[PDB]
Every structure is written in C-alpha cells, then in structure tokens.
Design a protein around this ligand. Sequence first.
Ligand SMILES: Nc1ncnc2c1ncn2[C@@H]1O[C@H](COP(=O)(O)OP(=O)(O)OP(=O)(O)O)[C@@H](O)[C@H]1O
Ligand SMILES: [Mg+2]
Lengths: 48, 719
Amino acid sequence: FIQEMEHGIYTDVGEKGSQLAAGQKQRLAIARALVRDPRVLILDEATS
Amino acid sequence: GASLAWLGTVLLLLADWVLLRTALPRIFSLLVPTALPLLRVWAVGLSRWAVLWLGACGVLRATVGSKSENAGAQGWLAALKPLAAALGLALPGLALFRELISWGAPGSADSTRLLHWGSHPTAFVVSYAAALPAAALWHKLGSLNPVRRLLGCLGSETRRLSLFLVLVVLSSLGEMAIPFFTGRLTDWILQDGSADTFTRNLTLMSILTIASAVLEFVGDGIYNNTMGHVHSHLQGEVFGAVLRQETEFFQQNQTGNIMSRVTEDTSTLSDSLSENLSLFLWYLVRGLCLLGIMLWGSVSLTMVTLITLPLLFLLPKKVGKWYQLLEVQVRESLAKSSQVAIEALSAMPTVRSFANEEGEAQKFREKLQEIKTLNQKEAVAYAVNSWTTSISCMLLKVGILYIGGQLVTSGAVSSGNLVTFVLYQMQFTQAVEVLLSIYPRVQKAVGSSEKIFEYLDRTPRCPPSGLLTPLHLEGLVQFQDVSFAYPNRPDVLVLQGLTFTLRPGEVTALVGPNGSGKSTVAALLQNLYQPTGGQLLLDGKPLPQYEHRYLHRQVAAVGQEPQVFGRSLQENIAYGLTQKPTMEEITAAAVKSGAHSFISGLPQGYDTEVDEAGSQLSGGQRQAVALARALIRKPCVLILDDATSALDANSQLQVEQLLYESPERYSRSVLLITQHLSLVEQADHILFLEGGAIREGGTHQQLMEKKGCYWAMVQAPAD
Ligand SMILES: Nc1ncnc2c1ncn2[C@@H]1O[C@H](COP(=O)(O)OP(=O)(O)OP(=O)(O)O)[C@@H](O)[C@H]1O
Ligand SMILES: [Mg+2]
C-alpha cells in the first residue's frame, strides 16, 4: 500500500496517522520496529 | 447643457461681484440704524446668501430640463448651494463669534465698517478664496480594508465606549478648569499673607483633581469591562466558526495549529485592541483640546500645522503591509511550534520507547529559530520607525518655528500669541507622535488577526443541517450506487458502486481486507462525508435533510479506535444527549454493553474520572464504554466498526446477545463491520467489500457454496 500512495514513502501520513487505515498503521508500526534489527521484540497485539 | 451651466455660473459670479457687492450694503445701511453694525453685516450676508441660493436653484431647474449631456456638470453644480452659503455666512458668523468672545476687546473691522469690507474688492476676493475650499471639502464629504474588519468587533459596545469618551472629555475639562480659575501657581502661592486666596485656590485645585481622578476611574472601569466582553465574545465566535467547518478542514489544519489560532491569536488581538484603543481615544481628545488652544493662539499657524500631518502619515501607510506580512509569518511559526509541542506531549510513551526526546526538541528548536529570525526584523523595524517618527515631528516643529519667525518679523502675528501657539504646538506634535507610534501596532494586529478572521469568514464545504425530525424513524438505510473519493485525494475512488440496504431487525456484516473501504462506509453512514456519486438514503431521504442532533442520535456508531474524553464514565456514556439521562438508563446501557462489570468494581464507580487519552481503561473496556455510549441513545441504525476486536469473552457474549437475541433488535438495523467470523456466520446478510467494490454477497451458506473470496478468507488459516 505504500507504492499506491501519492508520493510513495514521502507521503504525509497525517496527524496521528489519520490519513491511513488501521491495518496500514499497524503495518507501518511493525516496519518501524523492524527497521532497527532489535535484539528483543515485543509484539503487543501487533496483529489485532 | 454644460455650456448653459457654465454661462449661468459666470453670470452669477459677475452679478455677485457687481450688484451684491455694493448695492446691498447701501440698502441695509439706509434701512438699519448705524447703532448695530453687526446687524447690518448679518442682513447683508443673509441677503447675499438668499440671492445666490435663488440663482443656484434657478440654474439647477434650468439644467434639469435637459438630460442629453453628462451628469458631471450636475455633480459640479451640486456644490453651488454650499458655496453660496459659505460666501453669505462666512463674515457674519465670524463677527458674531468675535462679539460673543469678548465685550470689551472687539476685533472690529468686520462687524463695523460693514460696507468698507463688503464692497472692499480685497475682502470680496478673500471671502471667495476662503469659501471655495470649505465648500469643496463639505461637498466631497457629503457626496460619500482589513482594518474595518478588525474594528467591526466594537459594534455592540458603542453605547459604552461613548460613555468612556464622555468621561474622558469631562476629565479633560476638569483638568483645564484649574488654570482658568486659579491662574498660574506663583499668582497665589508666593504671595505672603495669603489666607483667602491660598486656601481657596488649593481647595479648588484639590477638588478638581479628585473629580478628574474619579471620572478616570469610572471610565477605565467601563472600558475594561467592555474590552473583557469583547475578548470573550470574539474567542467564542472563533471557536464556534472552527467547529462549524467540514471534516477535512481538520485534516489540513492540525490540532495544535487550530488551538494556537483560537486561544493565542485572539488573546493577542484583544490585548492590542484594548491598549491601543484606550491610548488612541485619550490622545485624540487631548489633541483636540490642544488644537482649540492653538486656534486661540494663531489660526493661520494652526491651519499650516494641520496641512502637513498627511506628510507625516505617508510612510506608515507604505510600511503597514510589511508589518502585516511579518506578523502573519510570526503567528504561523508560533502555530507550527504549538503543533510540534502538542503532538510530542500527547504520545510520550511512544517518544520515550524510541528514545526520541532529542528529535522532538530539535523540531521545536527549528520552529523557534524561524520565530527568532522574524523577531530580528521586528526589532530593527521598531528602531527605524522610532527614528522616523522622531525626525518627522522634529521637522514639523522646526518648520512651524521658522514660519512663525517670518510672520513675527512681518508683523502678521504678535510675539505673545506666537509663543503661546508654539508652546501648545509642541504638545500637539507629541500627541501626533503617539498616534504615529500607534499606527504600526494596528497593522501588526491586522496581521495577527488575519487567520482567525479567515476562519470566521470561511464557508464550510459541507451541506447545512436539515429540519426533518420525524417522530418515528424506521431505520431503513439504502446505498444506491454510492461512490466516494477523499477530498484531499479525489482522483482515487475508495468506494465504487456500492448498492445495498440495511433493514430493521436484520444484521448486515461487511467483511474484507484492509484498505477496502469499510470504515469509509461507516463514515459515510454517519454523514461525516458526502458521497461523490450515487445516493445514501435514511428512511427514504438523504442524510443532509435531517437535523444534525436528531440524525446523530438516530444513527450511532462504535468506531475502530473509540475516542474517550477526560471526564467521568457517567459523562462519557451520555455524551451529546440534550437531556441528561438518569443513572438507571446509564447502568442499563452499561449492562447491555457489558461495561457494568468493570465500572462497578472501580473505587469511585461511574464517577471515575478518565484520563485524557483513556489510558486507565484497558483495551476492550474502552470499546465497552463506547458501545454503552452508542446504545444509551436507542438508535435506529447501529454501526459496529471492528468493535469486537478487544472485547473479552463476556462482552463478546453480551454483544452477540444484543445483536441476535435482544428484543430491541427488531427496532434497529446493524452494520457489523468485523473480522470475527463467529458473529458474521449468524449475520442475516454478508457483503465482501474488496478493493472498494462488493465482490459478492448473501447469507453464509450461499457464500460458502460459491467458494469465492469469502470461502478463501475463511479457509485461509486452515491452509
Ligand atoms: N483521511 C483520509 N484521507 C485519505 N485517504 C484516507 C483517509 N482515511 C483513510 N484513507 C484511505 O482510504 C482507504 C480505505 O480506508 P478505510 O479505513 O476505509 O479501510 P478499511 O477497509 O476500513 O481498513 P481496515 O480494515 O484497516 O480497518 C485506505 O487506502 C486509506 O489509506
Ligand atoms: Mg477501518
């Protein structure tokens, strides 16, 4: 869904990610968490 | 037309110069005794005015007969009457005023020697030259910007600012009555043996000072109360206007920005208004008093002073726009800083969980750097404007001094009157400097109020609320070829050709992958957005035809991430009801939604104040509170937007009972957006909204038989 946006990864998401679906927000949060290559990963209702 | 009018005007001028110049003084000297020269002058002036007015009326009547030529000639002729009035009544009025001023020091030479001035060609030319500009100004005035918008706020408060002005004038009169009754200080204080003059003057001065102080006290109280009312009213109006806008206006303008505009721009505007308006009115009154004194001193030099004020006000008129733009930029930067701060302070767990306090600080510092670069220009402009005002008033004083010296050398003005005029003209120029300093502040206030007045004058891009409040509403919703594209990205269609119907007593599940458009359907059914195509009917009529509050108590929705305000749970459950419900209704709703179990266990029960973000309520409890809030209205249409995601087993059983078992199900239609197939399986209708279009529909058995998208979704985990 990122490539379907107007400007790809440079598209403004809105305040509190308002211009997004809930699943898109969860996927973006997962991507943010994974970009760090964390040693410990805590998925708190990451797939609700 | 024009030629006849010009010929008539020339004939009138010649007649006035020939006959009225000489014949009238002789006639009124023979008719009137010599003991009343003022009476002779008044009679001659009245006769001249009458003759000229009759001539002007005749010329106007003659010109009205023909209408073939332009109307400019008539416009010019319109000033013949005031010009004639000035010509006739300039001399007698001055003579009467001079006689009334003093009965022992006549200026003479006008009232007396009446024919010696009426027939005097020099005096005739002087009267014409004096009457021409006064008549021109009067005619120009009679024939008859963001600052007007700024000052329109003081509309309903005129009756109180008028009292303020009256009290200011009374205080000024009391201030000036001291020298006119007690004289100069040394006249009584220095005299040795003063018993009936020192005490009298001291008591009179003290009484006048006390009266002026009390008048100023009352006026200031009235003014401050009025300004407080203005401030409150303006803030309320701005907030209401902001809330009257459309749903996307709040996606273009962010929360902190709007909050800064509503709370901070208005406050600065009102403070500037109050300070500068009080200053302006006070200095206007005192400058008028100083002008009166100056006129008493030397009329010619006072007119010369009044001629040159526009020269002093030229430059401010040029730089006002620069001031406005500067202040607009300053307000915008402050709003951006407010947005950064609001966004950071509302998600502190997220900021700290990623160790990004430094980044938020850096963003705030960047906004503050913008504001700093603007403040540098503010300060430099302040210094330069101060220099300009000081130099302007200094040059005014110097020029008046030079002209007064020339006049005193030429013998036109006596030395004492010249000194008095100079001493009061210095104060007048100081007041002029104060007003010049006020002007940039007004320009900056315009700049500050630009955005809030844009809010106030903005036209919401949404239909107005209707008037339909039927006593009984069935709850039958109909989407007919409804299509929608979000206003920010109208080129993409989120919904394409949705056609379906919600009937009371039935449940219609809306299933599909993420981004399909289900929450968009819920938002359309709540009247948050208007469909671009098709039509959406509630009980056979469009949603905009229903009243706002009626519609929003007849259609209730539990959102995907329900919002809970910072109030007691009792106030959250009943949020928006005109009549506050009784605790029996609130507890019944909580029982229906399953929120009674945990609310009752709270130490304070339903009076438990909720945090701003609702962090006290865990996931599932907040959804139960939102469901109770939806259900307390007894709506005809009930939307559940992924409302069972966080509910535990007990609340899931409660919602299942509410949907498919409760006796009230027959009085409402439910749109059940969900992904829990347990509730979808019992749904009377199922709609697979994939990609914004309903790929399939029907009951559970039919979709399972079709082995289409629904079957694939159901058996995906089993693969
Ligand atoms: N305010 C908005 N402005 C622009 N596009 C938006 C806005 N809100 C949502 N969208 C987009 O509209 C599409 C549909 O969003 P919507 O929330 O209606 O889908 P959904 O199927 O209900 O999502 P989910 O299953 O994740 O809850 C998505 O592509 C989303 O990014
Ligand atoms: Mg959704």
